[PDB]
Amino acid sequence: RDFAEFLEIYGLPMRVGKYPTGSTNREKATLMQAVMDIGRRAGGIIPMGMTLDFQSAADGQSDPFMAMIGWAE
């Protein structure tokens, strides 16, 4: 079950967006929608004040889970 949960959140880094403190409430909504619209071969234009980065939320291999499963079996 832990292996399945790890596989669920694997190989898809989280997309974050940084906005200046002077941004309007509506401007945050547009950025949030734009972050949610990333897939396949995606483009996009970002202002100089804003930044976009990808951070991986899970890393590792399947060797230990499979080793334990095989030992138990």
């Binding site: 967006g17 906005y19 200046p20 403190t21 002077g22 941004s23 309007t24 409430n25 509506r26 401007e27 547009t30 950025l31 734009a34 619209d37 990333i38 897939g39 396949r40 071969r41 995606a42 483009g43 996009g44 234009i45 970002i46 202002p47 004040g49 804003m50």
Partner: protein, 139 residues
């Protein structure tokens, strides 16, 4: 324009504006046409920085824009000899305008009702439809 001649006469005494308009007019009677031209130039200067984030003309005018326009117009009128305080205020106003253009500060909303001016999409991305997403629920 974001400000009228009456608004300028509210911040500054009518005597000072009359003294300013004394040489620019041809006759002895002071003329407010130069004041209107200064107001128009000030509005254009403000719009130059405002065009970065909000579509023009503005749907709703923030209250502070009136004071900023009055300040820069008064600086424009006092071109023959500017005092220290007038130059400092104009520099502060242009610094605030640059901060607004860069997105480091919000222009604000009108006091009568909470409403921010409309603007174009600063950030936009494009991609093909997402097949095989978790919203499919077909498999």
């Amino acid at each position: 324009n974001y400000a009228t001649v009456n608004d300028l006469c509210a911040r500054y005494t009518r005597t000072r504006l009359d003294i300013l308009t004394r040489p620019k007019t041809a006759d002895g009677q002071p003329d407010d046409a130069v004041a209107e031209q200064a107001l128009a130039d000030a509005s254009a200067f403000i719009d130059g920085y405002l065009a970065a984030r909000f579509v023009l003309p503005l749907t709703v005018v923030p209250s502070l824009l009136k004071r900023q326009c009055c300040v820069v117009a008064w600086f424009y009128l006092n071109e023959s000899q500017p005092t220290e305080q007038i130059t400092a205020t104009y520099r502060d106003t242009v610094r605030w305008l640059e901060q607004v253009r860069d997105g480091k500060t919000d222009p604000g909303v009108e006091s009568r009702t909470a409403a921010s001016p409309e603007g174009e999409d600063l950030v936009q991305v494009q991609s093909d439809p997402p097949v095989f997403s978790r919203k499919q629920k077909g498999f």
